[PDB]
Amino acid sequence: QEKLLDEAIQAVKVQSFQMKRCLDKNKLMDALKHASNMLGELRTSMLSPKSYYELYMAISDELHYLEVYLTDEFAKGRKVADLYELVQYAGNIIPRLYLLITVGVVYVKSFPQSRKDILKDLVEMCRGVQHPLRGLFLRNYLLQCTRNILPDEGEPTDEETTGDISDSMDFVLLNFAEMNKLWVRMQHQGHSRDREKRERERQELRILVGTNLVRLSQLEGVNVERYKQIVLTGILEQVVNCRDALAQEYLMECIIQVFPDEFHLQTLNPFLRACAELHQNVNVKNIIIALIDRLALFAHREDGPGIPADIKLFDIFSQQVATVIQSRQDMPSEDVVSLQVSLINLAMKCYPDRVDYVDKVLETTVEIFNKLNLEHIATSSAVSKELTRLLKIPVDTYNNILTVLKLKHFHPLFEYFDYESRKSMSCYVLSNVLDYNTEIVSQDQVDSIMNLVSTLIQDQPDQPVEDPDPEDFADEQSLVGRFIHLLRSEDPDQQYLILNTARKHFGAGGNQRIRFTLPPLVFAAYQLAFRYKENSKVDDKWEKKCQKIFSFAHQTISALIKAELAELPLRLFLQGALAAGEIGFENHETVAYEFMSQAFSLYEDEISDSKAQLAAITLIIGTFERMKCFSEENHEPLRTQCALAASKLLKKPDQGRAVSTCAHLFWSGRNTDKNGEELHGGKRVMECLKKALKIANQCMDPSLQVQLFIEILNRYIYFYEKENDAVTIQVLNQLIQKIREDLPNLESSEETEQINKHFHNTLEHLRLR
Amino acid sequence: QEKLLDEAIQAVKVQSFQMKRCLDKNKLMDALKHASNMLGELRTSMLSPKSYYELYMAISDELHYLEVYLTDEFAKGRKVADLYELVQYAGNIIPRLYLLITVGVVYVKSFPQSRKDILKDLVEMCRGVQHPLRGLFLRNYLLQCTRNILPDEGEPTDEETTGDISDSMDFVLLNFAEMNKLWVRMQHQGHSRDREKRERERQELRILVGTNLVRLSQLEGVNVERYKQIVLTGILEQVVNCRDALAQEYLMECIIQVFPDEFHLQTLNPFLRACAELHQNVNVKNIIIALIDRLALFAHREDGPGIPADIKLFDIFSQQVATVIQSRQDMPSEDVVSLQVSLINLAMKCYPDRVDYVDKVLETTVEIFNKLNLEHIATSSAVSKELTRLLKIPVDTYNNILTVLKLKHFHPLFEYFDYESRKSMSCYVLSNVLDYNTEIVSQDQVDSIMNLVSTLIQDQPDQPVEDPDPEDFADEQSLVGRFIHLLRSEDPDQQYLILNTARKHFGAGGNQRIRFTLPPLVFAAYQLAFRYKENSKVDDKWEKKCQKIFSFAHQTISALIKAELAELPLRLFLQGALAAGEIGFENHETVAYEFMSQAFSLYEDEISDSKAQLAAITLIIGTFERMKCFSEENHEPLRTQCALAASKLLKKPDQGRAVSTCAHLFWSGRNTDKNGEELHGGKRVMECLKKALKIANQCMDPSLQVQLFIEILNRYIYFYEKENDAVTIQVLNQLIQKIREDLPNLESSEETEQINKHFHNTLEHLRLR
Amino acid sequence: MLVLVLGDLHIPHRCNSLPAKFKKLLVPGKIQHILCTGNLCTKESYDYLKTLAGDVHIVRGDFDENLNYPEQKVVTVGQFKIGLIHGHQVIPWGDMASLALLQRQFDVDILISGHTHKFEAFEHENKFYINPGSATGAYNALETNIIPSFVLMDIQASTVVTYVYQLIGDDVKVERIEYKKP
Amino acid sequence: MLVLVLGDLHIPHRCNSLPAKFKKLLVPGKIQHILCTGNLCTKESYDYLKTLAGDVHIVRGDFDENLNYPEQKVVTVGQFKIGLIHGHQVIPWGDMASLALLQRQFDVDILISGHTHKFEAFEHENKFYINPGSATGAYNALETNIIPSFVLMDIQASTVVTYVYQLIGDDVKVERIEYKKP
């Protein structure tokens, strides 16, 4: 409708205008008659809660001009006695009580001696109140009137003036209990179908109720002991006695927010035991979270003593929240976890130091999850969402992942999760383990981490299943790379053991995996092999350590070999050979010779492509050429075996290149006979170039024939200028002649020109032609 | 109506009854009164010419019975004079004159002295008649009466009989002029709206006209000399002067049919000048063809003088026809060519000797086509049809095709063919040039052939050629077959050149064509290589010839390689390798090595299919082994490279079979060290079988595992009995047993039984059973 | 029944057709069976074959275009079980011992194969071996002198008479050979 | 223009990334060219490179996973013709005479190669040779003491100034070397 309101405010402004008119003209009772008829305007009630409220606030503001008028009058001494009796002539209860409050506060100001008596009267006679709307607005007027003048402790105490802080406290608690009664009574008045309207209106009025607590809080007298003994005992008596939920919850959060934590800390177990008896339909969770948030901002609030050690917050709150959960019957487990998250945050921020607390947290979370007969929680469940948000907090907050390995009870948490979520989180954690460089680990914790890796590399949707996905796969390697790196920073004796557990682990890796994982391990072996020789003084079994580790490498390599691979094992034998060569230990030649024959075997057996041949032989020659530990009895077999194998190849072009490459084998070929230098028998070098020449004379391809002569010519120059006396200048002349008598017979091509440039540069450099 | 007709035929039958009644009772004049009554029936105008014809034939055939009746009475001596006046008593002119003719011939028989006079009388007395139909029917009665009594060569020269051949000629020339006058007047009589009725009617009476010439032809007295001077000269003046087309054409056809070639050869050209002035609207082609047909049956007519050489008939008719065509206004070109076709057939069959004539004709046809600036001939156009039919006479007739190739203009006429028609006609012609097998061809004629192919296969297609079926998809086989055929007949070094030109020629043929064309050329190369060996006694530079021919083949093949095919070239390489091997020239070994390595290259690069894998490698192995000129130093490497290539395949079954097949390679090999004797490398053969065995033991697939064991077993027996000591009988026992201790561990199959039979037969074949 | 055995025609790779005289001897009606070893190569040659008779059997040769032919096939003709294979799969190419080894596996009384282009008709350990040769005398690198030929056998019952048709000179010489199950 | 030259990172075979300080010196915008010798191994390292600049050139090293890289490549940078190769193809491995022999064939004014993991910048017969070393100080059996490093050259015109970046101790020492076409 909304008209009632404007018409009413019109009539109100009329009567309060004629009211203030009579009050300036100083004929009081006529003003009080207009004021009375005006408050008669409040006898309509159909107004909206908001509308009625505005009319109320309007009339209160006009009454303020009256209150200051009276206050002045009494301060001027012009006081008429017995005002309550004369005013009780007003036939209705409403004028009487508006008059009583108004004159009461004036007398209290003017007669502080009368304060106790007037308050005790007003508090006792308000028990008459039974109607919700007018009673509410009256007791609000009471609350605003009582804003400041109530007894207090730092107040002048005239033994005529009676009333103390205890009296003020009793005053407000009593008026509160009566108003809250009417307000809850508001739940059931009217028809049961206005319940949402009713609850909306009450929600609107909740601030009216909380204003009592605001009033209680400005009371200077509120010491911790009064808070302990009086305030909470009264409030908890009504709360436990009211067994409602909407009001209790609102009022209790307002308390939480309002009072200082100093008072709360002295009154926690009473307040939390009270919290535990509350109604089941209550979202206690949001309350508790608000509480946790307030004590968290209280923990890291500095400019304070910190947490007194006698105050074992965690044990207290833990046991009471626990009691609250027992008191709760239908808790969503997700809600339990949302609280567990805040329980983490608290333990984390107040005591990073004390891990046993965190473990007690993990044990209670675990016990919760076990009593829950839950399967590995899929992506859809909010429960997994929460468990994720919970667990990442230790994961995110504990910068050092080594510290996690001090928590044995963490690993049990992996169990409850889905494989997909385990995979996501395991990626998240290990990524954190690399981002936060957390380094070389204790063996047992190395074990448990390796157990975690074994779960990553061995499990699939939530069991090992191959449902193939075209997607990346190489996210798992770099991680292991890092692991392996930090692993090597132990002392010598630890590595063999760590190496063995790493070995078994990768043995359990698979077949689709190990090709990329083991190479780093190979380099590990090498560096430690280097460590043993560089430390050949304080160790006497270092040569033995080298032998065992090289045997270890051989098996590991053979492991890679069974996967039916070629390239990698070939290279791993080369690197191992080189290492043993540099170490030069006892039996080192024999070991190297063994490692070599494995390499040769791989070469023959695992020989595939022309390109692959050239690459394999180039690697064999480069490794072979600097190897110098073998004496002629050992150097010579391999030497001839290599010469023949090489001379067997596929393609004549490549054939000529290889045969020419072999020269170096006859020149760099240095064995332990005359103590590492080559005997320098020009003759075998000559025969080598001879076969190369023969192959040239057979190629019969202009373009390639010429190109090959220019290379072999340059090669000749290298050895002539390398003082191979056998290289006569006469041979070079006869051949250059042949090359001259052939060079013209060419078409135009991109190469022939470059071959000319090469040749011209070559003749221009040397000057000895 | 047809009724008019029926009433007439009834009254006729009535009246012919009255004839026979009077003929019985000898009342001639009473029969003739009724004869007059029949002819009154002829006064009708409603009947059709055919209807009149039927009624006439009825009255004529019955009147002959009267005529013979009268003739008999007169033959009986009862001769009555004064007949001329009495027959004039008939009121109708027709009975009078019919009586005059009937009795006249009677006087001629009874009074031969009067024959001349009576005939001249009757021919002159015909001036009475002027109506076309009845006059015609009269003159028919005349023609049958005079059919036999006219003078001729086979008449008795009785000094009473009168009248000569000259009288007969004057008689018929006159009857001709008279009948054509009446007949032509029939053209313009009646309304012009009966043009189709008149011309149909004319067609009907046309036989009446031709019977006169038939009568002239039975005349023995029609000799060649009267025909030459007088008869044909007379006939041609009336004929040419009638300046009509329908009559001229009919009479001329009758001419063609009627006169002998005896008359025609002495009178063609007078007659042909007459032919040249004739009326424009006539079809002359049909005239000329009829003439051509008769002179054609004279050309191939045996037991006759043929054509005297002095009278060059073809040149005469050619020149006259040319003049006639000049005389023609716009005569369709297709018709000129239909005439050209008969001029071809004729010159070929009547003057086979003079091809040069046919060339003068083809050249003159060319000037005609040049003069006619016409666009290409549409597929519908009859002109192309005829030009095709024209060209085939040389094609079908002349078995000798060089002379066609000597026709320079034979190709330029092709211009007028449209592209679709160029394709269709060129295909048909070249196909005909092929269906006769063609022998050796000179370089120049290979050229003209290559020009024919280049026009047949491919210029740029007229439109971007859209092909449901691009050809008869491969219809060009015979073409290459023949090429190849004639090539082996020319002497050798020229052939190589021709082959090179053949290469460039087809290289320019197209894109998807040459794939089928060059292999045969490859086969050519081989055979020429064979010719070179057959010339190995007088020649030493044969090896140089060989070097060039194999080098030519190498490029050509590499060209095919670019065309991106693998398998086929592989076999072509095989054959080339074999060829060089058999030739055994210097550098032959090198040649064999390139063919092998390029083939291997193709194997590696172009490898896609397992089946293709097995087939290519089995063929490679099967092909090499006969390669036996190689030095052991060279033979041995290559073998191993092949063995290795084999050992790198994917699938285990095939791998085992192949590895076992390779054994022969290690034994059947022969070194050039043993002067042709086999290297006998049993040891390595054994090792081959060893590795094979190990691979066998891994089959673990029962049916094939065992069957494969059986082959390896056969291999052992083969070598054991082949004096290969390493093959112990103990191994064979161990293996037969192992197969025995395993054959049961098998479910029975169609195979397992055969495996027992095989094993028993195998042991029995040792003569040890 | 009488069967026709030919192959290695190699049309149009090396030959364009069967010799003139041979064409005059192979006419429809007479033949009830045809076993073709060789690579006739072109489907054009398969149709001609389909002319002489209706029941034609062909095995894939090392140069046939159509890959749809059998590597080898076993066809029963009355009392006789006959095997068919081109020959290039038999190593060494025309080796009797290798052919024989093949006979066991097939379990046939008679074994037809070609590839060598040399006519062969002989008996070995109670089994019969036939090689028609090349009906067109098709070229073959291993033998510089090839002789056109085909072979039709006549089976009465557990008795075969194979007629070998060679083209020596102009005239067509012939030879008779009889074999009867063991 | 200035170009960046590095290689032999060997990630993740022997190293996990470039030294901390070096990463702080290589930032986008500055580099217009990148010539990479070594085997960075993982495509992960190719992307990082693709960050510093857009025109990146890489040659295949003896341990790179992707076989799609060039064994050697010649790239022109202004007035300079520069060759690129990893080095393992040069025998003996770091031999000047062998590198030189290679320079002729390529016909380049400057030749970049690695494989030895030892920084080298020198002139020989009017040509320039550069070896960045290992940007990650990657392990190498032949030299027990490897020093991280890269090298960026600045070309104005027919004049180059190559800055060698070594990681000795903590600080990053530097050295300047100039070369100008003959």
Residue numbers in the entry:
A (entry chain C), B (entry chain A): 12 to 780
C (entry chain B), D (entry chain D): 1 to 182
What does the report in the manuscript say about this coordinate set?
The core of retromer is a trimer comprising vacuolar protein sorting (VPS) proteins VPS35, VPS26, and VPS29. Here, we elucidate the structural basis of membrane tubulation and coupled cargo recognition by metazoan and fungal retromer coats assembled with the non–Bin1/Amphiphysin/Rvs (BAR) sorting nexin SNX3 using cryo–electron tomography.
Using local reconstruction and three-dimensional (3D) classification, we found that, for both metazoan and fungal retromer:SNX3 datasets, the arch is asymmetrical. One VPS35 monomer is more curved than the other, and the two monomers interact via an asymmetric VPS35:VPS35 dimerization interface. Arches are assembled into linear chains via two homodimerization interfaces—the asymmetrical VPS35 dimer interface and the symmetrical VPS26 dimer interface. Asymmetric VPS35 dimerization has possible implications for retromer function. It leads to an asymmetric VPS35 surface at the apex of the arch to which cofactors could bind directionally and with a stoichiometry of 1 cofactor:2 VPS35 molecules. For example, a D620N mutation that is associated with familial autosomal dominant and sporadic PD causes loss of affinity to the family with sequence similarity 21 (FAM21) protein, the retromer-binding subunit of Wiskott-Aldrich syndrome protein and SCAR homolog complex (WASH). D620 is part of the buried interface in straighter VPS35, where mutation may disrupt the coat. D620 is, however, exposed in the more curved VPS35, where it may contribute to a single FAM21-binding site at the apex. The interfaces of the two VPS29 subunits at the apex of the arch may also be differently accessible for binding by regulator factors such as the Tre-2/Bub2/Cdc16 domain family member 5 (TBC1d5), Vps9-ankyrin-repeat protein (VARP), and RidL, the effector of pathogenic bacteria Legionella pneumophila.
